[PDB]
Amino acid sequence: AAGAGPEMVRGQVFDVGPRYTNLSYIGEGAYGMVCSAYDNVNKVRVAIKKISPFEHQTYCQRTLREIKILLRFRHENIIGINDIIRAPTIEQMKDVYIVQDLMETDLYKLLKTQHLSNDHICYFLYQILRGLKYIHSANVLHRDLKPSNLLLNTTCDLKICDFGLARVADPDHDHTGFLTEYVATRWYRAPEIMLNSKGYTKSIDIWSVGCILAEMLSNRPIFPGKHYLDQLNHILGILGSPSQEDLNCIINLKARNYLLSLPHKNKVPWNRLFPNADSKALDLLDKMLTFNPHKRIEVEQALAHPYLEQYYDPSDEPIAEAPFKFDMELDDLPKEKLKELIFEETARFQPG
Numbered sequence: 550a551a552g553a554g555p556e557m558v559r560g561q562v563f564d565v566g567p568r569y570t571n572l573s574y575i576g577e578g579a580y581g582m583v584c585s586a587y588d589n590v591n592k593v594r595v596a597i598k599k600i601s602p603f604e605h606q607t608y609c610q611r612t613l614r615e616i617k618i619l620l621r622f623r624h625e626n627i628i629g630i631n632d633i634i635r636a637p638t639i640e641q642m643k644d645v646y647i648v649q650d651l652m653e654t655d656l657y658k659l660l661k662t663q664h665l666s667n668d669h670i671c672y673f674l675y676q677i678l679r680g681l682k683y684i685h686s687a688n689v690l691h692r693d694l695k696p697s698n699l700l701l702n703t704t705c706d707l708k709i710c711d712f713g714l715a716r717v718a719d720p721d722h723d724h725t726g727f728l729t730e731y732v733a734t735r736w737y738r739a740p741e742i743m744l745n746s747k748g749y750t751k752s753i754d755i756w757s758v759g760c761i762l763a764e765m766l767s768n769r770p771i772f773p774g775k776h777y778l779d780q781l782n783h784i785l786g787i788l789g790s791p792s793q794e795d796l797n798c799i800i801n802l803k804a805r806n807y808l809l810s811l812p813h814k815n816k817v818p819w820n821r822l823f824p825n826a827d828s829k830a831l832d833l834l835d836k837m838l839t840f841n842p843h844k845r846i847e848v849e850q851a852l853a854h855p856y857l858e859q860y861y862d863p864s865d866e867p868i869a870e871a872p873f874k875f876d877m878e879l880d881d882l883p884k885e886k887l888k889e890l891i892f893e894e895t896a897r898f899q900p901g
């Protein structure tokens with residue numbers, strides 16, 4: 550019965566039961582509108598995503614993936630699911646509403662108009678890596694880290710969101726051919742994605758965090774490629790031509806020979822790109838934005854880097870109780886089974 554800001558974009562009815570009232574529109578998610586609401590039980594305002602995914606297989610897969618992961622994760626720097634609202638039967642289930650802590654902004658919105666102090670950059674980076682340590686400890690890859698997926702509240706607490714493209718790490722099966730299509734956001738893709746990688750190793754996430762650090766330093770994306778291959782040219786325009794050793798790491802001939810066909814490009818020094826940056830921040834940046842993914846710094850090493858010395862505390866940087874081993878591919882399931890799994894995964898929040 551309750552309604553919010555009609556128009557289009559799948560967001561006429563916003564029916565979150567009696568518990569959640571005084572709806573205020575926030576914006577458009579991917580599968581419906583997002584609103585803040587007053588939680589009449591906890592007596593605080595929360596965020597609620599309306600999800601109407603049952604039309605398309607892809608929407609379903611990403612929705613199930615996120616729900617399974619977020620329900621199993623519990624960490625200060627990862628958004629949780631507080632509640633899920635849906636019909637009591639599969640027959641009647643047409644939408645799903647996901648209730649989460651209210652986070653007033655995200656890093657994308659912040660960077661549009663706000664300069665970050667070095668102390669803010671340091672703190673944000675620490676929180677990103679702290680959350681990522683937990684994710685990776687569960688053998689999970691986020692695979693779409695970017696500023697819009699980093700939520701922030703009014704006290705600068707940071708929570709990672711959107712596990713719709715996540716996968717279980719599988720380095721033994723990471724190899725693929727040259728120019729293999731990829732789904733995750735272009736500007737934050739590691740170079741190897743375009744060369745020989747399916748993005749099934751943890752190093753894929755570290756690259757993205759490096760891009761996020763660079764973006765925090767200057768309020769501009771570091772590698773804003775306009776299309777698939779342009780992205781690699783942006784990366785090489787700054788890192789310079791890869792070394793013989795790094796090139797020899799790429800066994801696939803089409804990828805190798807593409808790189809060999811390019812004119813020699815020298816490295817652009819970080820301190821020229823970011824003249825106001827802390828030198829320790831640039832040392833860490835360099836280690837995150839390493840061309841060779843085998844040489845790229847790992848999350849725990851990054852946390853231990855001198856730039857983050859004010860925050861580093863391994864005992865207060867928790868890991869997951871056990872790795873995830875459930876299917877995150879979800880590609881050989883008919884629409885009927887996907888809907889059923891979403892129904893089952895969301896059952897715990899029902900009065901029953």
Ligand SMILES: O=C(O)/C=C/c1ccc(O)c(O)c1
Pocket residue numbers: 575577578579583595596598628649650651652653700
């Ligand atoms: O765009 C989306 O998909 C939702 C974003 C969002 C915005 C604020 C929040 O507190 C939250 O949990 C999620």
